[PDB]
Design an enzyme around this catalytic site. Structure first.
Site, mmCIF file in Angstrom:
data_model
loop_
_atom_site.group_PDB
_atom_site.id
_atom_site.type_symbol
_atom_site.label_atom_id
_atom_site.label_comp_id
_atom_site.label_asym_id
_atom_site.label_seq_id
_atom_site.Cartn_x
_atom_site.Cartn_y
_atom_site.Cartn_z
ATOM 1 N N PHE A 148 0.858 -1.218 0.000
ATOM 2 C CA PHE A 148 0.000 0.000 0.000
ATOM 3 C C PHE A 148 0.884 1.256 0.000
ATOM 4 C CE2 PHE A 148 -2.594 3.232 2.267
ATOM 5 C CZ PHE A 148 -3.537 3.477 1.264
ATOM 6 N N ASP A 166 3.792 1.111 2.974
ATOM 7 C CA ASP A 166 5.037 1.844 2.774
ATOM 8 C C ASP A 166 4.896 3.296 3.218
ATOM 9 O OD1 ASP A 166 7.826 2.062 1.386
ATOM 10 O OD2 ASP A 166 6.647 3.673 0.474
ATOM 11 N N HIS A 207 16.608 6.328 1.272
ATOM 12 C CA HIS A 207 15.525 6.775 0.417
ATOM 13 C C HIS A 207 16.000 7.246 -0.973
ATOM 14 C CE1 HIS A 207 11.333 8.884 0.493
ATOM 15 N NE2 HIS A 207 11.666 8.519 -0.741
ATOM 16 N N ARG A 231 -10.296 -0.911 -2.478
ATOM 17 C CA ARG A 231 -10.913 -2.259 -2.408
ATOM 18 C C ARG A 231 -10.726 -3.049 -3.722
ATOM 19 N NH1 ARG A 231 -14.247 -2.952 1.890
ATOM 20 N NH2 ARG A 231 -15.135 -4.762 0.764
ATOM 21 N N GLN A 232 -10.678 -2.313 -4.809
ATOM 22 C CA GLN A 232 -10.412 -2.840 -6.105
ATOM 23 C C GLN A 232 -8.963 -3.387 -6.239
ATOM 24 O OE1 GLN A 232 -11.246 0.084 -9.457
ATOM 25 N NE2 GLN A 232 -9.209 -0.693 -10.050
ATOM 26 N N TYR A 275 7.302 11.762 3.854
ATOM 27 C CA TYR A 275 5.900 11.920 3.554
ATOM 28 C C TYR A 275 5.106 12.701 4.580
ATOM 29 C CZ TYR A 275 7.167 7.979 0.453
ATOM 30 O OH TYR A 275 7.797 7.195 -0.460
ATOM 31 N N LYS A 277 11.717 5.003 5.520
ATOM 32 C CA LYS A 277 12.869 5.408 4.730
ATOM 33 C C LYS A 277 13.615 6.539 5.329
ATOM 34 C CE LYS A 277 10.217 4.231 0.453
ATOM 35 N NZ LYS A 277 8.851 4.767 0.847
ATOM 36 N N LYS A 302 -0.604 3.151 -4.461
ATOM 37 C CA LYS A 302 -1.253 4.153 -3.606
ATOM 38 C C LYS A 302 -2.688 4.457 -4.086
ATOM 39 C CE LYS A 302 -2.659 8.723 -2.744
ATOM 40 N NZ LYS A 302 -3.551 9.583 -3.565
ATOM 41 N N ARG A 334 -11.195 2.540 -4.973
ATOM 42 C CA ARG A 334 -9.963 2.078 -5.635
ATOM 43 C C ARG A 334 -9.127 1.194 -4.740
ATOM 44 N NH1 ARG A 334 -11.410 6.711 -7.929
ATOM 45 N NH2 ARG A 334 -10.011 8.225 -6.872
HETATM 46 N N1 LIG Z 1 11.173 5.504 -2.991
HETATM 47 C C1 LIG Z 1 10.683 6.593 -3.644
HETATM 48 O O1 LIG Z 1 11.441 7.550 -3.948
HETATM 49 C C2 LIG Z 1 9.194 6.629 -4.065
HETATM 50 C C3 LIG Z 1 8.723 7.431 -5.132
HETATM 51 C C4 LIG Z 1 7.379 7.470 -5.507
HETATM 52 C C5 LIG Z 1 6.498 6.613 -4.840
HETATM 53 N N2 LIG Z 1 6.949 5.849 -3.771
HETATM 54 C C6 LIG Z 1 6.003 5.009 -3.037
HETATM 55 O O2 LIG Z 1 5.186 4.344 -4.006
HETATM 56 C C7 LIG Z 1 3.801 4.643 -3.783
HETATM 57 C C8 LIG Z 1 2.917 4.684 -5.034
HETATM 58 O O3 LIG Z 1 3.429 5.540 -6.064
HETATM 59 P P1 LIG Z 1 2.651 6.888 -6.404
HETATM 60 O O4 LIG Z 1 2.295 7.542 -5.098
HETATM 61 O O5 LIG Z 1 3.302 7.701 -7.494
HETATM 62 O O6 LIG Z 1 1.188 6.330 -6.882
HETATM 63 P P2 LIG Z 1 0.739 5.100 -7.856
HETATM 64 O O7 LIG Z 1 0.647 3.903 -6.974
HETATM 65 O O8 LIG Z 1 1.522 4.974 -9.119
HETATM 66 O O9 LIG Z 1 -0.719 5.605 -8.232
HETATM 67 C C9 LIG Z 1 -0.912 6.843 -8.868
HETATM 68 C C10 LIG Z 1 -2.406 7.268 -8.861
HETATM 69 O O10 LIG Z 1 -3.196 6.208 -9.300
HETATM 70 C C11 LIG Z 1 -4.459 6.303 -8.647
HETATM 71 N N3 LIG Z 1 -5.048 4.938 -8.521
HETATM 72 C C12 LIG Z 1 -4.826 4.020 -7.518
HETATM 73 N N4 LIG Z 1 -5.597 2.949 -7.734
HETATM 74 C C13 LIG Z 1 -6.302 3.199 -8.912
HETATM 75 C C14 LIG Z 1 -7.275 2.523 -9.697
HETATM 76 N N5 LIG Z 1 -7.743 1.276 -9.449
HETATM 77 N N6 LIG Z 1 -7.771 3.085 -10.840
HETATM 78 C C15 LIG Z 1 -7.397 4.317 -11.222
HETATM 79 N N7 LIG Z 1 -6.472 4.986 -10.513
HETATM 80 C C16 LIG Z 1 -5.927 4.441 -9.372
HETATM 81 C C17 LIG Z 1 -4.240 7.030 -7.308
HETATM 82 O O11 LIG Z 1 -5.172 8.111 -7.109
HETATM 83 P P3 LIG Z 1 -6.390 7.927 -5.973
HETATM 84 O O12 LIG Z 1 -5.704 8.124 -4.644
HETATM 85 O O13 LIG Z 1 -7.312 9.077 -6.251
HETATM 86 O O14 LIG Z 1 -6.944 6.501 -6.080
HETATM 87 C C18 LIG Z 1 -2.853 7.590 -7.453
HETATM 88 O O15 LIG Z 1 -2.835 9.012 -7.345
HETATM 89 C C19 LIG Z 1 3.902 6.027 -3.146
HETATM 90 O O16 LIG Z 1 2.678 6.481 -2.516
HETATM 91 C C20 LIG Z 1 5.046 5.843 -2.170
HETATM 92 O O17 LIG Z 1 4.552 5.085 -1.043
HETATM 93 C C21 LIG Z 1 8.251 5.836 -3.424
HETATM 94 O O1 LIG Z 2 7.023 9.127 -2.851
HETATM 95 C C1 LIG Z 2 8.252 9.359 -2.751
HETATM 96 O O2 LIG Z 2 9.082 8.647 -2.095
HETATM 97 C C2 LIG Z 2 8.722 10.670 -3.404
HETATM 98 C C3 LIG Z 2 10.018 11.157 -3.208
HETATM 99 C C4 LIG Z 2 10.439 12.358 -3.760
HETATM 100 C C5 LIG Z 2 11.774 12.855 -3.720
HETATM 101 C C6 LIG Z 2 12.115 14.242 -3.741
HETATM 102 C C7 LIG Z 2 13.452 14.600 -3.801
HETATM 103 C C8 LIG Z 2 14.450 13.650 -3.877
HETATM 104 C C9 LIG Z 2 14.128 12.299 -3.947
HETATM 105 C C10 LIG Z 2 12.795 11.930 -3.818
HETATM 106 C C11 LIG Z 2 9.493 13.080 -4.512
HETATM 107 C C12 LIG Z 2 8.193 12.618 -4.678
HETATM 108 CL CL1 LIG Z 2 7.073 13.554 -5.606
HETATM 109 C C13 LIG Z 2 7.789 11.414 -4.136
HETATM 110 O O3 LIG Z 2 6.499 10.967 -4.290
#
Ligand SMILES: NC(=O)c1ccc[n+]([C@@H]2O[C@H](COP(=O)([O-])OP(=O)(O)OC[C@H]3O[C@@H](n4cnc5c(N)ncnc54)[C@H](OP(=O)(O)O)[C@@H]3O)[C@@H](O)[C@H]2O)c1
Ligand SMILES: O=C(O)c1cc(-c2ccccc2)cc(Cl)c1O
Ligand SMILES: [Zn+2]
Length: 318
Positions: A16, A45, A112, A273-274, A50, A79, A265, A271
């Site tokens: 999640f 996660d 991170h 539950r889906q 965040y 992270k 996310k 979404r």
């Molecule tokens: N390590 C890092 O640097 C890093 C970077 C980016 C992300 N992450 C982690 O990865 C997670 C997910 O990546 P992300 O936040 O970019 O989002 P994502 O999981 O790629 O989803 C993007 C969008 O899709 C929508 N969505 C979710 N389920 C859906 C469905 N069934 N149908 C249509 N749309 C759907 C969501 O909006 P709704 O909320 O409106 O459903 C969300 O805004 C992050 O929240 C974070 O925990 C880590």
């Molecule tokens: O979800 C995450 O972990 C995330 C991390 C950064 C970030 C920003 C600066 C440097 C590295 C990561 C930026 C966005 Cl928009 C993210 O959603």
């Protein structure tokens, strides 16, 4: 469904995601995280970045107190942010996350992003002209402090995020390494499928955890608003119709079938539950190949605000 990490610990293959864009009230993380557990998510996660650690922690502990889940049933990731790379700052950072979560340990703790920034409260510290204040830290030293968090029992497993092949090799080949990273959490979906990196991680017993698997939050200005929208993809839409499901579930299933641990996310109850239904269907090999064909080098989260420093991970081929 779980995957055995190179540390013996187990990780649920569906995760999640909890990041939301700055404009979303912090209260939203609370109900959404409760909704996810209820729907069946077990691997959540989060990270210091965040600004949600407290809400997610409230949610999880509510679900443990109501009796829905036991702590051992939840796999929670945190992270270490760029401002605490310095070896002596690592444990305090982790301990601060823990105090905010009100939990005694995280299941997983990641470096991170491999570029460090000036220590302090500000997550992205800038000079008086708005220029980013970067720091110079040996990531090998950061890693050895991360290792002591595992020795202390404060993190069950430890891993990395946004590392390239060069940087994975620098940790792996470090004199006296105690624990390899259990995972590399990076951007992965049909447009940017990271075949080369996924193969490399596999070869070294490292899991690839795919973030922005649904095409990302599309928050500005972190992701170009002119990029194609992953979930409008015609082939994901045709595959969705053929299997009585949506494009999001197709992108999620794709990662599960290629050996990837996948995050999703959503703060929308429908979404949420889906998304757990990804375990209810499967794709054939020819459908997997069709999805493989979608790969177009579209990296949504370039994090190019952090380019310049030597450790910027994305100038290399992978
Ligand atoms: N390590 C890092 O640097 C890093 C970077 C980016 C992300 N992450 C982690 O990865 C997670 C997910 O990546 P992300 O936040 O970019 O989002 P994502 O999981 O790629 O989803 C993007 C969008 O899709 C929508 N969505 C979710 N389920 C859906 C469905 N069934 N149908 C249509 N749309 C759907 C969501 O909006 P709704 O909320 O409106 O459903 C969300 O805004 C992050 O929240 C974070 O925990 C880590
Ligand atoms: O979800 C995450 O972990 C995330 C991390 C950064 C970030 C920003 C600066 C440097 C590295 C990561 C930026 C966005 Cl928009 C993210 O959603
Ligand atoms: Zn099929």
């Amino acid at each position: 469904q779980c995957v055995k990490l190179n540390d013996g610990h187990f990780m649920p293959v569906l995760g999640f995601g909890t990041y939301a864009p700055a404009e979303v009230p912090k209260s939203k993380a609370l109900e959404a995280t409760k909704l996810a557990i209820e729907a069946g998510f077990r691997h959540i996660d989060s990270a210091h970045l965040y600004n949600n650690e407290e809400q997610v922690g409230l949610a999880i502990r509510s679900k443990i107190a109501d009796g829905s889940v036991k702590r051992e049933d939840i796999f929670y990731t945190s992270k270490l942010w760029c401002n605490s790379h310095r070896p002596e700052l690592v444990r305090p950072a982790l301990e601060r996350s823990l105090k905010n979560l009100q939990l005694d340990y995280v299941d997983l703790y990641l470096i991170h992003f491999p570029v460090s920034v000036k220590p302090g409260e500000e997550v992205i510290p800038k000079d008086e002209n708005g220029k980013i204040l970067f720091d110079t830290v040996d990531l090998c030293a950061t890693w050895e402090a991360v290792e002591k968090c595992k020795d202390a029992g404060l993190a069950k497993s430890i891993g990395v995020s946004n590392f390239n092949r060069r940087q994975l090799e620098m940790i792996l080949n470090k004199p006296g390494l105690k624990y390899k990273p259990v995972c590399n959490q990076v951007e992965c979906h049909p447009y940017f499928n990271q075949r080369k990196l996924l193969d490399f991680c596999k070869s070294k017993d490292i899991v690839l955890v795919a973030y922005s698997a649904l095409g990302s939050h599309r928050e500005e200005p972190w992701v170009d608003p002119n990029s194609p929208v992953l979930l409008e993809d015609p082939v994901l839409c045709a595959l969705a119709k053929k299997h009585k499901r949506t494009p999001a579930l197709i992108a999620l299933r794709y990662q599960l079938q290629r050996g990837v641990v996948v995050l999703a996310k959503s703060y929308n109850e429908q979404r949420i539950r889906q998304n757990v239904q990804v375990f209810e269907f499967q794709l054939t090999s020819e459908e997997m190949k069709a999805i493989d064909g979608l790969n177009r080098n579209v990296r949504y989260l370039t994090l190019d605000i952090f380019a310049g420093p030597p450790n910027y991970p994305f100038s290399d081929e992978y």
